[PDB]
Amino acid sequence: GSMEGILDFSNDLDIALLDQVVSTFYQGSGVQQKQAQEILTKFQDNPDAWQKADQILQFSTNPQSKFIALSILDKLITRKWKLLPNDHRIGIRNFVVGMIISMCQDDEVFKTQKNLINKSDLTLVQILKQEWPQNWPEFIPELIGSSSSSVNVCENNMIVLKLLSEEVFDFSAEQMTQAKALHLKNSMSKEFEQIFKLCFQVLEQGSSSSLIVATLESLLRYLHWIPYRYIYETNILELLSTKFMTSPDTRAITLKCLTEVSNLKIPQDNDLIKRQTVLFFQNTLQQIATSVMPVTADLKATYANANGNDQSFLQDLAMFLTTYLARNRALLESDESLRELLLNAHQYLIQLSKIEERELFKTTLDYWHNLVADLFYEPLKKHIYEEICSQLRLVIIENMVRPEEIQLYKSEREVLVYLTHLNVIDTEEIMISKLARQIDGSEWSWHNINTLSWAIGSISGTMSEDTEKRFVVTVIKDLLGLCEQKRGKDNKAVVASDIMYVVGQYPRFLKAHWNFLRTVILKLFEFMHETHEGVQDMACDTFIKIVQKCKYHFVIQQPRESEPFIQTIIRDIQKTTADLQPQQVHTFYKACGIIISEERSVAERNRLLSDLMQLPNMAWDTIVEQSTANPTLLLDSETVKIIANIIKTNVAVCTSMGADFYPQLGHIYYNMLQLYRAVSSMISAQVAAEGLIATKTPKVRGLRTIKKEILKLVETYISKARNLDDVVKVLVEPLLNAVLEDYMNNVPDARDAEVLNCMTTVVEKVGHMIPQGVILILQSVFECTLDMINKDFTEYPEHRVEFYKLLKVINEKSFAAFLELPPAAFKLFVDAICWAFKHNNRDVEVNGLQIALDLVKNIERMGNVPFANEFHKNYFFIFVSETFFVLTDSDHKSGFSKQALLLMKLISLVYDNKISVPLYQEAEVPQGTSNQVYLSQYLANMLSNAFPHLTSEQIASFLSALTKQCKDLVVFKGTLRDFLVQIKEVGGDPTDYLFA
């Protein structure tokens, strides 16, 4: 409609048309809002729009339209500022300064348009970043002076200074050059004395709390960088720790200042500073106890009620206490007059640790770790904290988390192990009595018995063996008693699981007591028949868990047994696993494989292996004989399931046995590869008959599962294989014949990416022994896979990833295969690497850059031969420029380090004269010219065309620096980062590249 009129800049801008378009955005909806959105975007991104900003600041009455006007100004200041004439720079400064003063003098505007004031202040700071102090030396004196006149201007000057400190010290690293950062840092440092007088004066003499809060907000930022003397050699610690902790508006921010004060860089050998560090802590804790809550207060309840900013305050208090005590608790541990202070502060942390809030708990748990670790190692320190640690035991136990939440559980276990060592008796007592309160029913629930079980299991291996024996027996008896007492299948299942959980966490006890181990395992077998949800998984998981740790006790003959128990498991294996689902059976077989790998007599291991594999070897043989006599049977989905499950059972046993799996692989190997071909035919047949949609059907997916599990079995064995001669002479040739041609000759949607994966492993382990085999792999998968993945970045994601892993390992282990490629296909290899650079997907990007880097190294290693000379003539400048393209386009930032390293390597080759031939075609440049000189000219030309807003001086300076610094990587990276900043703006200083 009429809204699009504002895109016409030939006319004067209609302010009422702007404010309504802006209103339609911030208060409207639907098609109306979406239309205004695209107009404000197109208005803002018009490069002339900044000229029509002084107009809006005066004439408009909408704060949003003014905000948007300043955003357009901000964009000009950071990006095009140095291109303006000197008068436009001064003109803009003046009406930004003037708008701020006039908004501060009007109390109505100062209260109600805080968003528009803060935005103006930020826009002022962007001028300072361009113009201060070199073209504005009187800014800080004029700021301090104007703060006398109006209390509102004083407050806003504290917001300006806060933002200035943020932009110079906290966010400069990425956003400005190294040299500009240092200049601005030195400049703020030079005049901070004068800034600190005004700040300390306002905090001493001021009564306006909104002014005081803003002043403390600025102090928080100053504390990141200022020298310690400003805090210690003035009164300011007393003020923070007493005056400002009493009032709640200032408390929040003061507490954050003291947290940062606790981290200040301080001399550690001065007694007066130690007392000052003790004092501010003493004062702070005193204010908390008298003005906020006493030590005994239920912080869990307070936090859960969530009144005002209580949650944030208790968070900040935990951060203050943990930070200070981690650094300074030693100061309070010797003097007996400071003992109450030490224990009170720790008692607050105990109460904070009871808060129901996961991320807060982590914060306090990090501190408890730091403390109890120190009590475990540091002498004469644990007696001090005996009452704190006893309370901590109960807190950790009651908040214990399942092993599945890995980071939290690990942290909790570590703390609880330390606390168990510090006082085993106390830990035992708390756990036994917690268990008694499950038996009497006063704390009984599924969650509560579970959490206690996870805690009791976590401290395994910390007690003496004798103490552990008494403790485990007592826990198991009580838990067994608990199960008998409880009524219903749900209740008894929960307790049986926990019984089984604890048992699996105590292998030392299982190892010493064979009779008990046997009973447990037989019980798990009974539980493998229970249909109740989760029980069968629990039984299987516990079984493999016990076996991983106690395997040796299954493989030997125990006294009073006729045979090793592994034989006994293998006998009833059908009856034992009959009611399990297929992957539960596979875990069972894998567990048996762990045990069998312990037997070191070859003949006995092999006998156990074939006995274990009896069922799947009999089912296998009756399917080979059936389905090879008539391929019709493989369409029967039930037969496909049976075959996949045989291969899966083989994978599972191969996973735990590795090199020891070889004889079993041999029983099935040749028929399995024949099955792979018969299955391959079926798949191509259904694709022709039914179409590409056939690859989605249950029958084709079932067949492909057979292929993938076969590839997975072979990869698994080969990855762990000890006898590489057998791998090459027996396994490899039949594998390549079975898989490569089938892959090459299928349509893209029927190619299994698992083929590439399997080949990666084969080249990794035995590539060095099969050079003609690696060549055959390349020919079969290279061009056909590259064509699947070189039209966009999205399609065939698995193939894409496995493709670049395969080339990576070929380039390391058998580089000769790339030499034998005809030049046309070698050109595609280079194309394929550069294509990998341009990916966002991290797995592809990282390998692309690594392959490039390794390829360059491979060519360097060839020396002064025609292939190296011709590689450099054809591809050196391609790699330099394609690397440069991703360094500078702002869409491959995740790969900076690897890009920089590759670029540094390429530049260093010319710097050390390690490219023998010239990189230029004859008579393009004078005849005697070094590659160094021509590298500089190619690069200067390349960057002038790519970034035409850079001056020739900028480009030449950047290149001198970059090439001189191609031995020191960290400095090189700095120079690259400086270039990345300067390309985002106009008029960057070329001297900036002399920083290092």
């Binding site: 024996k469 027996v473 198991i476 008896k477 067994l480 199960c483 009524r487 219903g488 299948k489 008894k492 299942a493 049986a496 019984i499 007591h513 009779n515 008990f516 009973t519 447990v520 019980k523 539980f527 229970e530 109740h532 029980v535």
Partner: peptide, 18 residues
């Protein structure tokens, strides 16, 4: 005997009521 008496009790652990 304390370990043996616990082992015996373990043997009769069940999920069923009757």
């Amino acid at each position: 005997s304390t370990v043996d008496e616990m082992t015996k009790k373990f043997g009769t652990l069940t999920i069923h009521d009757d």
